[PDB]
Amino acid sequence: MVELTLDPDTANPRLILSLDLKGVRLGERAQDLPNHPCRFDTNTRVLASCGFSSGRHHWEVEVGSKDGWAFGVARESVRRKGLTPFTPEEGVWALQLNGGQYWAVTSPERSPLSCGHLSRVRVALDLEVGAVSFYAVEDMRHLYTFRVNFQERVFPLFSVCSTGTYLRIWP
Amino acid sequence: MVELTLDPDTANPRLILSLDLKGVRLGERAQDLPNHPCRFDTNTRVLASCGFSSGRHHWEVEVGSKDGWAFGVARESVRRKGLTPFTPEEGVWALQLNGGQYWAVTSPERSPLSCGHLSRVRVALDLEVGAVSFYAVEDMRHLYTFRVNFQERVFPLFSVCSTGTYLRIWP
């Protein structure tokens, strides 16, 4: 597994990153941070500092039990300023917990998942065949695969639009 | 006293307008409406059909007891597409109920008002002197005044960003 860290420079200023830069939640207030072109100024998003041009890579994401997270991967060109749709068309390929149910975020309609309570999810990115896949860690049961002809650097993606949920990288 | 009606062409498609076009609340889902350039496609806002370039006018607004509403006036050039900040610099001058607190929506910090409860508010717009003012109807007690050098037409503005509250024009 790749050893990843959240990129502070990308993080929506309302997000609180943990000291070790693996954990993320939504804060009560917009922090006063440098306005880097790479920082998401509206959508509640953060990328990992490491993105990938080729090869097979995987990592694990610990997930909160309550609504409000989405995670997976984003293309480097995902727009950082103004309200962006959270869709494959706008460069995001992700799972989401919303309305007490798990989804793969397709558009125009989201795709329901068929899993129990998720605690930890292995993300596997294959830039050779052009795919991102999600597995429930307990017994690596398959949750979902996006097939994508990725034509640029791809970054691990994390989003939290509610207080009282979270995401956290492992290892 | 001006008899205003809400302009359904401007209304965000999640908003539910009353048949006499006095009242507004937020609906659970977006309606499919003609995408006029004047329509707010993201912010939960609606304008009155009548705007004012000069003179002095006033009207009244019944307000829900619960969080989610904001009202006052907007300059015509308020951007209709994408997420706009709800601030004076972006062409909005409003009172807001949020977190059980009554606010004059100044920026970068909002201004908390001392008023315990509001049933009905009088908005007074004066383009001669260049100000917009709010009064509690009970005994016309002054709540707040924005001083604005208004350089274009100015519309009554209404916003409801959660279910379980409402606004309604009087008369």
Binding site: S159, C161 | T44
Partner: peptide, 7 residues
């Protein structure tokens, strides 16, 4: 409700 639009 509307919070999910900022995802």
């Amino acid at each position: 409700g509307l919070s999910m639009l900022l995802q």
